[PDB]
Amino acid sequence: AVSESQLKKMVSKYKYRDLTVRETVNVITLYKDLKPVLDSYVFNDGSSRELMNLTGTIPVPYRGNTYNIPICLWLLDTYPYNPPICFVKPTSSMTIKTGKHVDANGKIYLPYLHEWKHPQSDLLGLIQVMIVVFGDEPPVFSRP
Numbered sequence: 001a002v003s004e005s006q007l008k009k010m011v012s013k014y015k016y017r018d019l020t021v022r023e024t025v026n027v028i029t030l031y032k033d034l035k036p037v038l039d040s041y042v043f044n045d046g047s048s049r050e051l052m053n054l055t056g057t058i059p060v061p062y063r064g065n066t067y068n069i070p071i072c073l074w075l076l077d078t079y080p081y082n083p084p085i086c087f088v089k090p091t092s093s094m095t096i097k098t099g100k101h102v103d104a105n106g107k108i109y110l111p112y113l114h115e116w117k118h119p120q121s122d123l124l125g126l127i128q129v130m131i132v133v134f135g136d137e138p139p140v141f142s143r144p
């Protein structure tokens, strides 16, 4: 379990630890389905830095059918002035259908993000928007 005090230690490496910590509270307090976890990251330079990431699932209604989408959010050490890179966990029956916002590596582009004024949409906005911008056309789906 991650405590808020500990949360500071976890994102102490970032330059905006206050807004991020405060903002995460909003995300895990309202979206408890998103849990923060500490992870080790290795850069090409060989230098290592401990970064915290949000990992879990988001229930999404679709065609009367609902799927449990597993997603991992990695924050850049310069977050939130830097956009967050997202990765969608694929499976044998779930594939990535490239389209208007999904590439082949699982990158997610969202118009609200390009017009997101800091701090208005906030991370919490990204998740409900994720629930909406993916409901319009699930970039991923289960194929028998």
Ligand SMILES: *SCc1c(C)c(OC)c(C)c[n+]1-c1nc2ccc(OC)nc2[nH]1
Residues within 6 Å of the ligand: 039, 040, 041, 042, 053, 054, 055, 071, 072, 073
């Ligand atoms: S958020 C990715 C993830 C998940 C979902 C998970 O839960 C089933 C476990 C056990 C591990 N990871 C994950 N993927 C990683 C890539 C690199 C890294 O740094 C060493 N840590 C990762 N943890």
